[PDB]
Paper text:
The studied chitin utilization locus (ChiUL) is encoded by the soil saprophyte Flavobacterium johnsoniae, which is a Bacteroidetes member exhibiting gliding motility. The ChiUL of F. johnsoniae consists of eleven genes that encode four enzymes, a predicted inner membrane transporter, a predicted two-component sensor/regulator system (TCS), and two individual SusC/D-like pairs (CusC/D, chitin utilization system). The SusC/D-like pairs are believed to be specific for their cognate carbohydrate targets, and act in concert to bind (SusD) and transport (SusC) oligosaccharides across the outer membrane. The resulting ChiOs, and likely chitin crystals as well (analogous to the archetypal starch-binding SusD protein of B. thetaiotaomicron), are captured by the CusD proteins.
CusDI and CusDII exhibit comparatively low sequence identity (27%) and may thus have different carbohydrate affinity characteristics. In contrast, CusDII only bound chitopentaose and chitohexaose, with 10-fold higher affinity for the latter. It is likely that both CusD proteins are able to bind even longer chitin fragments, which due to solubility issues are not amenable to ITC analysis. Despite considerable efforts, crystals with bound ChiO ligands were not obtained, likely due to crystal packing, which for both proteins affected the predicted ligand-binding site. The overall structures of CusDI and CusDII overlay with an RMSD of 2.2 Å for 363 Cα pairs and display the canonical SusD protein fold featuring four tetratricopeptide repeats that act as a structural scaffold. The most striking feature of the putative substrate-binding regions of both CusDI and CusDII is the presence of two Trp residues that would provide a flat platform for binding ChiOs as well as insoluble chitin, as has been observed in chitin-binding carbohydrate-binding modules (CBMs). CusDI features W280 and W65, whereas CusDII displays W330 and W74 that are located at non-equivalent positions but may nevertheless have similar roles. While both glycan-binding platforms overlay within the known glycan-binding site of SGBP-A, they are offset from each other, suggesting that ChiOs are bound differently by each protein. The area of CusDI surrounding W280 and W65 displays several residues that may provide hydrogen-bonding or electrostatic interactions with individual GlcNAc residues of chitin, while there are fewer such residues within the aromatic interface of CusDII. This may account for the difference in binding specificity and affinity between the two proteins.
Numbering used by the authors: 36 to 149, 157 to 250, 263 to 505
């Protein structure tokens, strides 16, 4: 069971098209303006319109499929010393499973989860995260038995250690605004225990729940999704090599008909604007490279690029030892190269070096630059970009002025608990609601988001 259960959970974290489509693509992806153009993403994610199913899909599927399995693994490997390594792996898994959850809904059932479980305060959920990652790092050992059913890493515990520490750093940075002391402490700890050391250590699912769920969303939108004008303009105007690794060129001209010499080939779709409303029609906007949208497209969970960019930010705060600029450079290069696993033509080392050296970490714009780079690195993992945007306010997004925006253009700052919780778990539901100021609304804030 432990192996099979681990494999099932790992496959649920990327192959469940149900919430990859709704939570990653449509809402997170539209909120942080990774995408625009398709009906679903633009109408609901880009312009801000509520659909209960879309907002509660992550909740429903994490509690139905994932949390329970990983709890059962932890329970069944708990006192067997030849299973300790599995016990640790499962615990690391459990953080990755639950972290998205709290980050999207705030206070959530955790400690009593997996008939009326309480909602843990997010602060406690996070202390519990740090505890499990710390202890799980230490617990992974040569004498811990073998790890079976691991698709991320085929049971290499050395990679599990660094995954544990990189997750720890991600959580540390996420509470930088609300709990700076704990944040620094945990960043430093993560750094010294050892995070990812190259792109080889990246947490990936290779798809051969068996297909990439995100691509499932891309395909159910009838390949109607484009990158947003914000992203394309940023990649194009700064000469980022990732531009053509990600985007397909325009085929039509803004003036209609086939595109002629001289006219810009790379433009995204403005947030709030459907692809058929583009001046020139949808051909007059860049598309998404086909290898990114396949059932066999790999899914990236945690990255070396991310760890280096987070270390850049911690460095700039004086939390860890080193040069922010050097961490930053290593992060950008790692992000440019991480796209290769998607089937993208590797960028020449000369172009990477040229880009990195032409636009280094600058004097008063470190946080802006770091946020923007992470926002690029978290592409196809929009939940993380949405969180990092909520925490830092970076990158600055294009204003949403659509007259039918249900928030008047205000970015939603959480998704909301399903009303089923009010009907089946009323007391605890209401306690969490009270702690939010009296509402279960998408304009509410999670604990670490202290404007």
């Amino acid at each position: 069971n432990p192996a099979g259960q681990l494999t099932f959970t790992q496959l649920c974290m990327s192959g469940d098209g149900y919430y990859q489509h709704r939570t990653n693509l449509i809402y997170s992806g539209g909120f942080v303006q990774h995408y625009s153009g398709s009906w679903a993403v633009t109408e609901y994610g880009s312009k801000f319109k509520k659909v209960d199913e879309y907002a509660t899909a992550l909740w429903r599927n994490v509690y139905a499929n994932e949390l329970k399995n990983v709890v059962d693994i932890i329970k069944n490997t708990s006192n067997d010393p030849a299973a300790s390594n599995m016990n640790a792996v499962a615990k690391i898994m459990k953080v990755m499973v639950a972290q998205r959850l709290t980050d999207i809904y705030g206070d959530v059932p955790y400690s009593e989860a997996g008939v009326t479980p309480k909602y843990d305060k997010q602060q406690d959920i996070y202390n519990s995260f740090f505890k499990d990652l710390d202890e799980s790092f230490t617990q992974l050992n040569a004498s811990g038995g073998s790890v079976k059913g691991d698709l991320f890493y085929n049971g290499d515990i050395s990679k599990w250690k660094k995954l544990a520490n990189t997750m720890r750093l991600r959580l540390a940075m996420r509470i930088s605004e609300v709990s700076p002391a704990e944040a620094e402490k945990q960043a430093k700890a993560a750094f010294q225990n050892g995070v990812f050391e190259s792109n080889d250590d990246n947490c990936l699912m290779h798809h051969l729940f068996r297909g990439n769920g995100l691509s499932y969303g891309f395909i159910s939108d009838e390949h109607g999704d484009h990158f947003s004008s914000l992203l394309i303009d940023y990649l194009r105007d700064n000469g980022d090599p990732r531009l053509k690794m990600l985007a397909t060129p325009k085929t039509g001209s803004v003036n209609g008909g086939p595109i002629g010499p001289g006219e810009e080939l790379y433009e995204g779709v403005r947030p709030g604007v459907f692809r058929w409303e583009v001046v020139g029609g949808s051909n007059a906007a860049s598309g998404i490279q086909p290898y990114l949208k396949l059932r066999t497209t790999p899914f990236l969970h945690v990255s070396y690029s991310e760890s280096q960019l987070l270390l850049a930010e911690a460095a700039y705060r004086g939390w860890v030892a080193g040069s922010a600029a050097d961490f930053y450079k290593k992060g950008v290069e790692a992000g440019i190269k991480q796209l290769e696993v998607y089937g993208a033509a590797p960028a020449s080392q000369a172009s990477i070096d040229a880009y990195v050296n032409a636009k280094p970490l600058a004097a008063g714009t470190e946080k802006e630059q770091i946020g923007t780079q992470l926002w690029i690195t978290y592409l196809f993992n929009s939940i993380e970009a949405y969180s990092n945007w909520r925490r830092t306010g970076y990158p600055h997004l294009l204003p949403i002025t659509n007259s039918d925006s249900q928030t008047g253009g205000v970015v939603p700052t959480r998704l909301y608990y399903p009303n089923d919780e009010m009907q089946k778990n009323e007391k605890n539901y209401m306690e969490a609601v009270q702690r939010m100021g009296g509402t279960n609304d998408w304009t509410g804030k999670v604990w670490w988001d202290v404007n």
